[PDB]
Amino acid sequence: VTYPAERRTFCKREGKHTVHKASLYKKGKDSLLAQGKRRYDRKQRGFGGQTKPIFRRKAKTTKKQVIRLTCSSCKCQTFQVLKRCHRLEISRLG
Amino acid sequence: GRRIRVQRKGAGSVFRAHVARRLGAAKLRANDFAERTGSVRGVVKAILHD
Amino acid sequence: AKLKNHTSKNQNRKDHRNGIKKPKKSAYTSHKGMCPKYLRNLRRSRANDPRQSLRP
Amino acid sequence: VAMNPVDHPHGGGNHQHIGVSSCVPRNAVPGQKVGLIAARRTGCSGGKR
RNA sequence: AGCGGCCGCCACCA
RNA sequence: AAGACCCUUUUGAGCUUGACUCCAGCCCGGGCCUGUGGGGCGGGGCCGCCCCGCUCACCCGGUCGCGCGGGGACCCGCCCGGGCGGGGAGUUCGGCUGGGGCGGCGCGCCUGCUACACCGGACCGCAGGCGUCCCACGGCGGGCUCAGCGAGGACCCUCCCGCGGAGCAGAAGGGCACAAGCCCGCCCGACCCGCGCCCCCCGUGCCGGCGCGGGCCGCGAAAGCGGGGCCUACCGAUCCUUCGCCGCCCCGGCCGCGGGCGCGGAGGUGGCAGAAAAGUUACCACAGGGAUAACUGGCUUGUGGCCGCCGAGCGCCCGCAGCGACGCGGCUUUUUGAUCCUUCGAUGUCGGCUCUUCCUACCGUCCGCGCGCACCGGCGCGGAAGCGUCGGAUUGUUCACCCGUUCAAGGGAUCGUGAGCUGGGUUUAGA
RNA sequence: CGCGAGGGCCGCACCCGGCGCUGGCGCGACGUGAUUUCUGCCCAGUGCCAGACCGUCACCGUGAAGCGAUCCGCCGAAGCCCUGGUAAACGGCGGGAGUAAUGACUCUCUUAAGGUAGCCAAAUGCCUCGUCGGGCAAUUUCCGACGGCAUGAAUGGAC
RNA sequence: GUGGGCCCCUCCUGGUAAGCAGGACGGGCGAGGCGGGACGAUCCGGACGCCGGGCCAGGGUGCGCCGCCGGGGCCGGAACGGCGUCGGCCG
RNA sequence: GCCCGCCGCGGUGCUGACGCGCAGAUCGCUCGUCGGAGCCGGGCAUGGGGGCGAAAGACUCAUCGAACCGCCUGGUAGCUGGUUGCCUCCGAAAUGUCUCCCAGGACAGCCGCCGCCCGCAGUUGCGGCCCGUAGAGCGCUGGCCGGCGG
RNA sequence: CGCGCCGCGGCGAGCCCGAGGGCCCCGCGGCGGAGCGAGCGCGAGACGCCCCGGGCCCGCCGCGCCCCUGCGGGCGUGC
Ligand SMILES: [K+]
Ligand SMILES: [K+]
Ligand SMILES: [K+]
Ligand SMILES: [K+]
Ligand SMILES: [K+]
Ligand SMILES: [K+]
Ligand SMILES: [K+]
Ligand SMILES: [K+]
Ligand SMILES: [K+]
Ligand SMILES: [K+]
Ligand SMILES: [K+]
Ligand SMILES: [K+]
Ligand SMILES: [K+]
Ligand SMILES: [K+]
Ligand SMILES: [K+]
Ligand SMILES: [K+]
Ligand SMILES: [K+]
Ligand SMILES: [K+]
Ligand SMILES: [K+]
Ligand SMILES: [K+]
Ligand SMILES: [K+]
Ligand SMILES: [K+]
Ligand SMILES: [K+]
Ligand SMILES: [K+]
Ligand SMILES: [K+]
Ligand SMILES: [K+]
Ligand SMILES: [K+]
Ligand SMILES: [K+]
Ligand SMILES: [K+]
Ligand SMILES: [K+]
Ligand SMILES: [K+]
Ligand SMILES: [K+]
Ligand SMILES: [K+]
Ligand SMILES: [K+]
Ligand SMILES: [K+]
Ligand SMILES: [K+]
Ligand SMILES: [K+]
Ligand SMILES: [K+]
Ligand SMILES: [K+]
Ligand SMILES: [K+]
Ligand SMILES: [K+]
Ligand SMILES: [K+]
Ligand SMILES: [K+]
Ligand SMILES: [K+]
Ligand SMILES: [K+]
Ligand SMILES: [K+]
Ligand SMILES: [K+]
Ligand SMILES: [K+]
Ligand SMILES: [K+]
Ligand SMILES: [K+]
Ligand SMILES: [K+]
Ligand SMILES: [K+]
Ligand SMILES: [K+]
Ligand SMILES: [K+]
Ligand SMILES: [K+]
Ligand SMILES: [K+]
Ligand SMILES: [K+]
Ligand SMILES: [K+]
Ligand SMILES: [K+]
Ligand SMILES: [K+]
Ligand SMILES: [K+]
Ligand SMILES: [K+]
Ligand SMILES: [K+]
Ligand SMILES: [K+]
Ligand SMILES: [Mg+2]
Ligand SMILES: [Mg+2]
Ligand SMILES: [Mg+2]
Ligand SMILES: [Mg+2]
Ligand SMILES: [Mg+2]
Ligand SMILES: [Mg+2]
Ligand SMILES: [Mg+2]
Ligand SMILES: [Mg+2]
Ligand SMILES: [Mg+2]
Ligand SMILES: [Mg+2]
Ligand SMILES: [Mg+2]
Ligand SMILES: [Mg+2]
Ligand SMILES: [Mg+2]
Ligand SMILES: [Mg+2]
Ligand SMILES: [Mg+2]
Ligand SMILES: [Mg+2]
Ligand SMILES: [Mg+2]
Ligand SMILES: [Mg+2]
Ligand SMILES: [Mg+2]
Ligand SMILES: [Mg+2]
Ligand SMILES: [Mg+2]
Ligand SMILES: [Mg+2]
Ligand SMILES: [Mg+2]
Ligand SMILES: [Mg+2]
Ligand SMILES: [Mg+2]
Ligand SMILES: [Mg+2]
Ligand SMILES: [Mg+2]
Ligand SMILES: [Mg+2]
Ligand SMILES: [Mg+2]
Ligand SMILES: [Mg+2]
Ligand SMILES: [Mg+2]
Ligand SMILES: [Mg+2]
Ligand SMILES: [Mg+2]
Ligand SMILES: [Mg+2]
Ligand SMILES: [Mg+2]
Ligand SMILES: [Mg+2]
Ligand SMILES: [Mg+2]
Ligand SMILES: [Mg+2]
Ligand SMILES: [Mg+2]
């Protein structure tokens, strides 16, 4: 699957169609101060072993790839999700 | 499991040495003043089985 | 062991025992799903008819 | 190997046999440190001088 | 996912 | 004797380890315990290491403290950190299923058929498919016509006719010709905000589709069409994490960091309405189950066994003395299967020995007929169950195989017969 | 096979203990199982071990930034990784085609190595009541030979 | 409360078949007394308070055992055979 | 740590007796051993996931693949058994969906009771639309025996 | 003991033997009376025997327009 380098589509900030530039979305690194991580660290202190489940039985060999679309005129970000696929590359022209 | 044979010997009871009717612990003569400055004379009394 | 999978043997007799019900008389005239552009004009017309208007 | 598995790490089996290597490491714990402990080599051979 | 140079060693709450 | 075999229960226990999660113990490093001096290396513009004296802490020995030593600021101990760790601890070890297991996966979806012309309709029923692929293989407008037959043309070109016999990503069915196929031009409706219905269905969710109100756009002269790829499959809760708007809260105030919250996507559960999980028991279990196997009996009769009908042929000649292919019609329950109706708070489960009674589908003896019947001896058929059908070698054997004799059929009775025996086999615990 | 005592193996909640009234002709851990005759090949896998500090791998400590919480660097013990050794450690020890009725022979694919000396239808051979011979009137038993479903060398082989 | 069903008639699917296994409209037993089918949860009739009289469904009417006479004929199971007997059709 | 054999110590075969016993392991005959890793008495030591074992998962007071005693404890059971007077009025289901679900449940159906309020039908007739089965057939997608004419 | 529904008694925009103090007398909470919104917070009259539906009003999400004390007020529109 190939995705266009640039695309013209709706912007919410300005309220009309502008040209957006493509990039690939990636999950950022986990903070140490998010409340669920704080709760997990406190539960894991002391004797007793693992206190929460650990997922094993994996089935999918594919994730959903999501495109970041950054507006050229104002820097407003929008996201497009793609159907499941094995390779994705963005074109390179502009 | 249970405790194995080598683990039971450290506790003593039936694995202690059979020391009854032994002559004693065998040692050299203790170093003292006379031996450090000279020599002391002894005489062999018996030769014994331990 | 294995047990039975499926039957509909007694089900038409259970369906008939209390009669076959009918839908409420007011479901035939529910506004749900009609064009909004028609339901807007319907309200506007009545509000300006003195025989029908219910404004204080 | 003449014992049952409850009695010794070498016990059990439908034939009398150890099953794994009888070279055990130097840091094995008590109850586990049987057979040949921390052996540099094994077997019968000449040539030593 | 983490260092290194397909290899190693180490990480693991949907 | 509330089956000990077998199965089920979200009932156990002993044992094992490459199950899951951990604990003692041991090894390693820095710190405190902890003195008092002498030196070397390196870095950065004081910091890090390392080395070696002394004795006074601390530690060890000799001695009846009878005329004495050894180590030493290191070891031990303590605090925190990393590694090894079935020695030990706790727990788990899916489901469906013509019993369970091995195998398979109708466990989430899709097409045609089964299915008996509304809808709906079962099986470990039949023939198959899906976990992907495509910025064009998508949107729109214009133009064009495909597969091919026939007939021509130096060693692809032309005409004519052409209902699709081509093509439309991949299963199957359906759909489509100035098009839904092919080529060209311009594009990104493969968008944003807010609702409703259809299928499945308890009229809950999820996938998928359809119809609308309002923004902003693409193509077209325009009417129009467009929320992907013609239609029927191609996918995912709570909690947590991550990112993107526009804001609100941090509760005695105010400011800056940070944290939380209202909305929407993404990271995944294929056992697909979604626990985090390996084996073994011939040492054994508990609750139950004839809802379910191993043995009698019952229904069935493929397989086994026995019996007819026809007449290609064989039999020097001569289809029927004796035979009889290719085909077709039955019977039996002495084989083995198929099934799971009765029995799991128990019907003692192989054979042999002993003893009795029964069947006829008759092997010898009796009475009749037939012959490819001279005699002798054989062979075929009907009636006939009275008497006879034996002694041994090897095998637990039933069976089989040999030797011998007055020359030696086949079966049933809870696979007759264990409070009649025996205990060789099979069938607990030792090896 | 381990250990020279400031040690090794074991006990034990703690303090404190056993071997030890002991010292390598000793103590402790394992395997095989008198004698006679022997004990072959494989260190690739797993296990064990010693010699090197390559990568990885803690806290502590230290540098740069910050209002501070903190973030990012450097430093780097044992272990693993790497280089070797070891089978009386655990264990393992062959295919196809022709060639004088056989096959000394040859070509061939292949392993870490391709089962040696021996023994055998064995208390180990499925096929199987194997084949031949002894013994019997007659033997799925027996003995002797022959040669491997799945014989074989301290898993100790043969006698 | 129930979420083990089963049988009959017609219509089907796997299987050599089965008192085998799996589906469909309607009815039954389950949870339905009484009579009859010798005998049977389901077949043929008929669906039920306690009695007296009458009529009669289904099945039957030698004796067991409640109830019969008249009239016209004839005298478990397959392929395949029969100058047994009575009746036909074609020549 | 030689051989025959008495007491002693043990326990082979009869698969003998007995098997409601003399007995919760005994009796008869037969048999192993009998100077030694031999047999017997008293005192003392080792304590339960522990001991002790010339090793059988054996023995640890008729208890052992984890003793006995009291308590936690009337431990939990989707599983087996039982669950006590009369008459009257009504009256089922053994099916759909989801479920570590398949000997159990929740929601729907079926039924009871309590109500409350002001045309109807498990039927025929007449009219309009819908279906692709039995039969029939070979045009379509496939399959199949032969005979004439160019 | 807690939760749901039904029946009957007393009083009714109200109701009530808490505990306690002097089968009698006095006796707070509480619940009901207003909802909606994560929260800053804002906040219901228009009809009707009864029941059912329609219409309109309040909050939450969005958006025309006008204005004073102003990211504050007013008047509207839409699921
Ligand atoms: K958070
Ligand atoms: K923990
Ligand atoms: K133990
Ligand atoms: K133990
Ligand atoms: K142990
Ligand atoms: K023990
Ligand atoms: K073993
Ligand atoms: K049982
Ligand atoms: K059982
Ligand atoms: K069973
Ligand atoms: K069992
Ligand atoms: K149970
Ligand atoms: K269990
Ligand atoms: K057990
Ligand atoms: K046990
Ligand atoms: K264990
Ligand atoms: K372990
Ligand atoms: K376990
Ligand atoms: K429904
Ligand atoms: K769908
Ligand atoms: K729209
Ligand atoms: K989620
Ligand atoms: K989120
Ligand atoms: K039981
Ligand atoms: K059962
Ligand atoms: K049953
Ligand atoms: K049954
Ligand atoms: K039959
Ligand atoms: K049965
Ligand atoms: K049976
Ligand atoms: K039984
Ligand atoms: K019985
Ligand atoms: K006869
Ligand atoms: K060895
Ligand atoms: K030895
Ligand atoms: K030898
Ligand atoms: K090796
Ligand atoms: K090596
Ligand atoms: K090695
Ligand atoms: K050989
Ligand atoms: K032999
Ligand atoms: K071998
Ligand atoms: K069959
Ligand atoms: K009925
Ligand atoms: K006739
Ligand atoms: K004696
Ligand atoms: K006797
Ligand atoms: K006795
Ligand atoms: K003697
Ligand atoms: K002890
Ligand atoms: K003790
Ligand atoms: K115990
Ligand atoms: K106990
Ligand atoms: K007790
Ligand atoms: K207690
Ligand atoms: K239970
Ligand atoms: K139970
Ligand atoms: K009971
Ligand atoms: K389970
Ligand atoms: K169920
Ligand atoms: K259950
Ligand atoms: K229920
Ligand atoms: K045709
Ligand atoms: K809000
Ligand atoms: Mg913009
Ligand atoms: Mg009804
Ligand atoms: Mg043993
Ligand atoms: Mg063990
Ligand atoms: Mg039972
Ligand atoms: Mg029992
Ligand atoms: Mg369960
Ligand atoms: Mg268990
Ligand atoms: Mg267990
Ligand atoms: Mg364990
Ligand atoms: Mg199962
Ligand atoms: Mg579409
Ligand atoms: Mg599911
Ligand atoms: Mg055993
Ligand atoms: Mg049964
Ligand atoms: Mg037959
Ligand atoms: Mg059954
Ligand atoms: Mg009995
Ligand atoms: Mg009996
Ligand atoms: Mg019998
Ligand atoms: Mg008897
Ligand atoms: Mg008996
Ligand atoms: Mg045995
Ligand atoms: Mg041995
Ligand atoms: Mg060797
Ligand atoms: Mg061997
Ligand atoms: Mg049946
Ligand atoms: Mg019942
Ligand atoms: Mg009767
Ligand atoms: Mg009479
Ligand atoms: Mg002797
Ligand atoms: Mg003797
Ligand atoms: Mg006896
Ligand atoms: Mg208890
Ligand atoms: Mg109890
Ligand atoms: Mg009634
Ligand atoms: Mg059912
Ligand atoms: Mg689940
Ligand atoms: Mg699940």
Residue numbers in the entry:
A (entry chain o): 2 to 95
B (entry chain A): 2 to 51
C (entry chain b): 2 to 57
D (entry chain A): 202 to 250
Sentences from the paper on this structure:
Giardia lamblia (GL) is an anaerobic parasitic protist, which causes an acute human diarrheal disease called giardiasis and poses significant health and socioeconomic problems in poverty-stricken regions worldwide. As expected, we found that the GL ribosome comprises an extremely reduced version of typical eukaryotic ribosomes, missing nearly all of the eukaryote-specific rRNA expansion segments (ESs). In contrast, the ribosomal proteins are typically eukaryotic with some species-specific insertions/extensions.
Multibody refinement resulted in a slightly improved density map of 2.69 and 2.85 Å for the LSU and the SSU, respectively. Furthermore, the GL LSU has almost no rRNA ESs at the solvent-exposed surface of the subunit and the 5.8S rRNA structure is truncated compared with the human 5.8S rRNA; however, the base pairing with 28S rRNA is conserved. In the LSU, helices H14, H25, H30, H49, H63, H98 and H99 are shorter and exhibit different structures compared with the human counterparts, whereas helices H59 and H78 are missing. However, two eukaryotic rProteins are absent, i.e. eL6 and eL28, as discussed later. Most notably, the human rProteins eL6 and eL28, which are absent in the GL ribosome, bind and stabilize the extruded region of ES7–ES15 of the human ribosome that is located on the solvated face of the LSU. The GL ribosome contains an extended rProtein eL33 C-terminus compared with the human eL33. In the absence of rProtein eL6, this terminal region interacts directly with the C-terminus of eL32. Moreover, rProtein eL14 C-terminus also shifts to interact with rProtein eL33. The uL4 C-terminus exhibits a striking difference between the GL and human rProteins. In GL, the C-terminus wraps around the solvent-exposed rRNA region at helix H25.
